[PDB]
Design a protein around this ligand. Structure first.
Ligand code: HEM
Ligand code: HEM
Lengths: 397, 388
């Protein structure tokens, strides 16, 4: 076989695709890579089809991954009971069942209005204070959160604790014991919550869950593990949209389109979604459960495999001229939200927040543009999700 | 396990001490309170000595609170040696020598304000006409605001948002004033003078503090005035409703220092405790293990009512022997304007008691409302009248 490759945790200063990934891509359909932490190496599927296929083969377990030392990108690794991330059917299915209702298309169409109201207040502020403002800390961050806390079902008196605790995201890292108590707060509060809310209607996520624990269908010890991620999830929109904006704000050709013909931002937003390198490397792996012949290659049982949707999204077979941003692509079946029964639970809710951000920010912030040079925007370092550290923008006042 | 006590805001309508705190003080030297906005609980020392120690013991930082739940260059959130470097920079325009010096100008500015009310006539609100405008002016002299930048700096600095009004608007005044300060520091970068601004820029021009920190070091100061505007506002209040006080005052001038001290120790200047301190190395207090990383508060107020130190703590004596109150903090985090506010206070009390012969409240005591939802306590207005 081909020699194992080292895939360091490099910090690109920009939206730049990962070069080493680019390399592994042209090295063959499958490659062996060694990540920063954890022992051994791991398989890597770069081709669209193999990826979609690998992510949909029942023969790949994700639970076993909680018990091994798979070569990983993160320093620490502590999976928690209830987490969908390591859920395996029938488990997974049982769990998502308890919260899925809140993220449905019908569930999100009903929120748009209340989420628009939210965003509007936020815009009301920067508009009123004046142009020199950081869209990242004034809109893009407190917004996905608030909207999610709405779906989650955080009360109105709790509306300020929860937000204030959702500082696990931070600018970068508040500190080792910093976001520690914070994550220890939200999670505590959540148990407290779920414990009450037992036996109660309301599509409210904490209600459904807490009622499910009532019926023991997802009983505690799984609660703060299932809702945990869903609560903190807004974080992704805060960085992905931060990037959509960054490209729009540094590539006049894109902003032109985005503006010269709104109500057409639909495919454009899909293009950005596909093209953007959302995370810094590869996420959680999947363990091969019984010797699979992935793209003419005997992957033995017990062996771990990863998938790079990022690279998958660049497959020339599927996306002609993959590296060019187009904004006007055909059906463009990208995979930013994942695939298989581990597809993004918030994809639909995320899109809605994305469609509000771009539309609303481009609308109320007339002639929106960077307030500093492009070289002035810094990027998050050493973290799963890639993104601008801030965004100083200005607008006609 | 001292069940965490709950210490809500304070919708107090008067100069009344805070009863919740009155209660908290009885539980014991150490207690566990929970303040409104915020997540979690914190400790609280109420006895004099403990507070005059927690505040004076290295093992409790201030900058840590900055990485928890401030702007680069805030004396408030400062540890050592950064507190000096920073304080030293501007500490000379606030010395007893710098103040005794300023006194005449301050006395003049005040007289100016007084001339105005005297002319117009008896029904007047000392607050919006004297007590409030005065400190800004006097502090701006200290800060060294160029005579042309009066109507503007004074304008902005009025982002105290009286009771409320423009919370997203006060952000503009805060961005322009702070902007303005940054410029004043860029220039004067090679200056000299008491003028805090020039004197800062001077050190800035020598990187003894570097820019950035500039706008945050003088940020508070510039605004600092209001504290005097409300503390005296209270002093007067107690004089205009508590006669025995006003009597001691009028029939024994020359001896108003003690009285001004007693007033300082009694008045509950704020609605609650200020910033907290973090136990840097996990210390203990009175057989109580304070875990490192845990927050702790101290009430100078409660500290000023300590029976051990101030016998008959709640009584307003006006003649108290030494009375080592703690109205200006303790430890390096001791008030930088303490001396500047003392002179202003004395000029206010003294001038007003002479220029406004037989000063009297023009309305009933219950007609004087108080500030709500704000850190510092005080009258919203003070309708007074005098011999015309
Ligand atoms: C548009 C921004 C977002 C992107 C690009 C994104 C992307 C992804 C990806 C790639 C995965 C993993 C798929 C796999 O394992 O193969 C995932 C999982 C997940 N995402 Fe997102 N996500 C976004 C927003 C959100 C939001 C807003 C939430 C909820 C507040 C959310 C909740 C989740 C959850 C709960 C999972 C775990 C699903 C499972 O394993 O069953 N995501 N997301
Ligand atoms: C007589 C009215 C005033 C009272 C009762 C007062 C009281 C206090 C108190 C109790 C503290 C606590 C310090 C701490 O523990 O962190 C403090 C700090 C401070 N005060 Fe005042 N103050 C007054 C007027 C002023 C004025 C007019 C200024 C500006 C010229 C000012 C500037 C400051 C500053 C800069 C600090 C922070 C000191 C540090 O942390 O090193 N104060 N004040």
């Amino acid at each position: 076989p081909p020699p194992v490759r080292d895939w360091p945790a490099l910090d690109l200063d920009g939206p730049e695709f990962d070069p080493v990934l680019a390399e592994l891509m042209r090295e063959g359909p499958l490659t062996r890579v060694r990540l920063p932490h954890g022992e051994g190496w791991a398989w890597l599927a770069t081709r669209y089809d193999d990826v979609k296929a690998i992510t949909n083969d029942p023969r790949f377990g994700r639970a076993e991954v909680t018990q091994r030392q798979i070569t990983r990108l993160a320093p620490h690794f502590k999976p928690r009971p209830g987490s969908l991330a390591f859920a395996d059917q029938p488990d997974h299915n049982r769990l998502r069942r308890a919260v899925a209702g809140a993220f449905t298309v019908g569930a999100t169409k009903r929120l748009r209005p209340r989420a628009q109201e939210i965003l509007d207040g936020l815009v009301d502020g920067i508009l009123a204070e004046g142009p020199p403002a950081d869209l990242v800390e004034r809109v893009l961050e407190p917004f996905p959160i608030a909207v999610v806390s709405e779906v989650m079902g955080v009360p109105a008196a709790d509306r300020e604790r929860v937000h204030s605790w959702t500082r696990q995201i931070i600018s970068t890292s508040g500190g080792a014991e910093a976001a520690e108590r914070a994550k220890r707060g939200l999670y505590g509060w959540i148990t407290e919550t779920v414990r009450a809310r037992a036996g109660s209607e309301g599509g409210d996520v904490y209600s459904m869950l807490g009622a499910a624990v009532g019926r023991g269908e997802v009983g505690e010890t799984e609660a703060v593990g299932l809702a945990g991620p869903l609560q903190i999830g807004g974080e992704a929109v805060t960085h992905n949209v931060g990037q959509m904006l960054y490209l729009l704000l540094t590539r006049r050709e894109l902003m032109a389109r985005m503006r010269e013909r709104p109500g057409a931002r639909g495919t454009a937003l899909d293009e950005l979604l596909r093209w953007i390198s959302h995370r810094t490397s590869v996420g959680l792996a999947r363990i091969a459960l019984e010797d699979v012949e992935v793209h003419g290659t005997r992957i033995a049982a017990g062996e771990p495999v990863y998938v790079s949707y990022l690279a998958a999204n660049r497959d020339p077979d599927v996306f002609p001229d993959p590296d060019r941003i187009d904004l006007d692509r055909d059906p463009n079946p990208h995979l930013a939200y994942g695939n298989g029964h581990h597809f993004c639970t918030g994809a639909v809710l995320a899109r809605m927040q994305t469609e509000l951000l771009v539309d609303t920010l481009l609308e109320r912030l007339p002639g929106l543009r960077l307030a500093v040079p492009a070289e002035q925007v810094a990027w998050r370092r050493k973290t799963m999700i890639r993104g601008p550290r801030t965004l100083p923008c200005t607008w006609h006042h």
